């Protein structure tokens, strides 16, 4: 369809512009303030210390950031490539989340990562779609036990459908969105919004990598990080099905 | 047209994926553990690199400097070009709907993070439908293509049935040339990346993994005509091509 295609494309283009302009209005003043803040501290350390060069001060500013990206001294002797984070990094590939919090450096690892991605993602894509309704229909199966008693006095079976369909969406969005946010606030000390901001960026596989729920499982997290990707696997599989079940319902 | 099949096939795949993620991790371990992180012991040794080269600065003064710049870098400081100009903000929007999400430029405003959530919840399905539109219209290009596969291609010692599997190889290749090999040769000469690093970028970009370690649109010089516009066009058309080919192969 020549008309329907361009009607959406132009709608997307205007949507891309409008999103950027709102993003510009929300982030530009915070950036300008931070740069002038760096502009102020740059002066006083050059003022108080004439022996320090204007460049030598800047080389430090780089070496502080350019080295510790990516590490901080405001993470006790943890390795960036232990069996856990490597297992995390592998999952970020096939899930296409790709946090990028840990960066590849070896060229040999980059080549293997390419072929790891080309084979892995379709392999996970089947499993994710596989478990999707495999878990989904298994959970809509349990809905039926309710619908039995939920069908007596003045109860229409036609409405029993929607009183379990939205409920299936409810407790699923409850178990896989509200619950992890309530957990991540009490495990990673993120704010109530920062947890929702993480889960949404995680489940949408945008994977900004600014927030990561599995940097390092303390020293007594019994299965926290294992529970993290377990939340990712079942969380993606569930919400992928929700994004498609609503996709066929939207075919109007 | 859906197979349940998972009563026994799922566990065969799930356990395969588990062993695949493990094998991928243990190989990733040996490939990156020797180089490892740059954390901690880099700030600590550049700290003493400063104390020795500059006597007039006390340890207490330098310590505050690091926290003063860390608070600055935690807002959008750039060591020696805005990070949220109309170009990069447009770039940042695309990274959302395309689910690539480099994260090279991070959200810091709490108000921006909320708006981004709804922008993702709505934007991705919107781009998701449009991407299908450049697969259905490309389907007409394929219907026009099936006329080509019957003629010429099977006249040699080449079977007509495998011609379907061999003529599509050319349609795959010329697109794999136009959207994979072509940008890599460009990015090596525009972003000065090595011959491998460009391929590392393209594959990660198109697969929407988006590690963000490499970005072919940080800032388009000052004389680049439409380089950055060419970049999302490479993505928007690049995502569209593989979207069609992977649905076309969906026989
Ligand atoms: K995807
Ligand atoms: K990403
Ligand atoms: K993705
Ligand atoms: K940063
Ligand atoms: K991603
Ligand atoms: K990322």
Q: Which residues of A are annotated as a binding site for K(+)?
A: 96-99, 205-208
B119: closest chain A residue by CA: A19
DSSP-derived letter for residue A211 is S
CB atoms within 10 A of CB B233: 11
Tell me if B213 sits within 8 A of A104, measured CB to CB: yes
Tell me what percent of chain B is helix, strand and coil, each rounded to the nearest 5.
65, 0, 35
The structure tokens listed for A170 are 């409810």
Sequence-ordered list of residues with C-beta below 8 angstroms from that of A89, at least 6 positions apart, any chain: A81, A102, B25, B28
Task: State whether residue A124 sits within 8 Å of chain B by CB.
Answer: yes
The structure tokens listed for A98 are 């790709």
Task: State the virtual CA torsion across B20, B21, B22, B26 in degrees, nearest 10.
Answer: 100
Tell me if A64 sits within 8 A of B43, measured CB to CB: yes
Gap between the Cα atoms of B125 and A30, Å rounded:
30
What are the E-state strand segments in chain B? Answer: none
Q: Which long-range contacts (CB under 8 A, 24 or more apart) does A124-130 make?
A: A124/A94, A124/A95, A124/B17, A126/B13, A127/B10, A127/B13, A127/B14, A127/B17, A128/A95, A128/A233, A128/A236, A128/A237, A128/A240, A129/A237, A129/A240, A130/B6, A130/B9, A130/B10, A130/B13, A130/B14
Tell me the shortest Cα–Cα distance from B243 to chain A, in angstroms.
13
Resolution of this model in Å is 3.3
Task: State the virtual CA torsion across A238, A241, A246, A252 in degrees, nearest 10.
Answer: 180
Identify whether A85 is preceded by a cis peptide bond (ω within 30 of 0): no
The structure tokens listed for B14 are 């799930």
Query: Which ligand minimizes its atom distance to the CA of B100?
Result: 5
DSSP-derived letter for residue A215 is S
Say yes or no for a CB contact (<8 Å) between B42 and A63.
Answer: yes
Task: State whether residue A112 sits within 8 Å of chain B by CB.
Answer: yes
Smallest CA-to-CA distance from A90 within B124, B203, B211 is with B211
Gap between the Cα atoms of A96 and A90, Å rounded:
10
Q: Residues of B with CB below 8 A from A248's CB?
A: none
Tell me if B37 sits within 8 A of A103, measured CB to CB: no
By the 10 Å C-beta count (0-12 exposed, 13-18 middle, 19+ buried), B239 is classed as buried
Q: Residues of A with CB below 8 A from B106's CB?
A: 208, 210
C-alpha dist (Å) from residue A120 to A92, A93, A188: 11, 8, 29
Give me the total of CB pairs closer than 8 Å, taking one residue from chain A and one from chain B.
339
Q: Residues of B with CB below 8 A from A50's CB?
A: 56
Task: State the virtual CA torsion across A25, A26, A30, A33 in degrees, nearest 10.
Answer: 20
Smallest CA-to-CA distance from A131 within B138, B5, B178, B156 is with B5
Q: Which long-range contacts (CB under 8 A, 24 or more apart) does A224-228 make?
A: A224/A187, A225/A84, A225/A88, A228/A88
Gap between the Cα atoms of B100 and B235, Å rounded:
10
Number of helices (H) and strands (E), helices first, in chain B? 10, 0
Say yes or no for a CB contact (<8 Å) between A23 and B115.
Answer: yes
- Residue ranges of domains in chain B: 1-251
Say yes or no for a CB contact (<8 Å) between B126 and A11.
Answer: yes
CATH architecture of B1-251: Orthogonal Bundle (1.10)
**CATH topology classification for A1-252:** Helix Hairpins (1.10.287)
Tell me if A9 sits within 8 A of B79, measured CB to CB: no
Sequence-ordered list of residues with C-beta below 8 angstroms from that of B176, at least 6 positions apart, any chain: none
Method: X-ray
């Amino acid at each position: 369809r020549s008309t329907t295609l361009l009607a959406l494309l132009a709608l997307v283009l205007l949507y891309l512009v409008s999103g950027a302009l709102v993003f510009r209005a929300l982030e530009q003043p915070h950036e300008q303030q931070a740069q002038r803040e760096l502009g102020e501290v740059r002066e006083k350390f050059l003022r108080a210390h004439p022996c320090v060069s204007d460049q030598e001060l800047g080389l430090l500013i780089k070496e502080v950031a350019d080295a510790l990206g990516g590490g901080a001294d405001p993470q006790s002797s943890h390795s960036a490539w232990d069996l856990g984070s490597a297992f995390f990094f592998s999952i970020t590939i096939i899930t296409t989340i790709g946090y990028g919090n840990v960066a590849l450096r070896t060229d040999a690892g980059r080549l293997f990562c390419i072929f790891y991605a080309l084979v892995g993602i379709p392999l996970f894509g089947i499993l994710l779609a596989g478990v999707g309704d495999r878990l989904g229909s298994s959970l809509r199966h349990g809905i039926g036990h309710i619908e039995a008693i939920f069908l007596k006095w003045h109860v229409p079976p036609e409405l029993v459908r929607v009183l379990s369909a939205m409920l299936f969406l409810l407790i699923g969005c409850l178990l896989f969105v509200l619950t992890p946010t309530f957990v991540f606030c009490y495990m990673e000390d993120w704010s109530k919004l920062e947890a929702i901001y993480f889960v949404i960026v995680t489940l949408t596989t945008v994977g900004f990598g600014d927030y990561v729920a599995g940097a390092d499982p303390r020293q007594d997290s019994p299965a926290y990080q294992p529970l993290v990707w377990f939340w990712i696997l079942l969380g993606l599989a569930y919400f992928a099905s929700v994004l498609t079940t609503i996709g066929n319902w939207l075919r109007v």
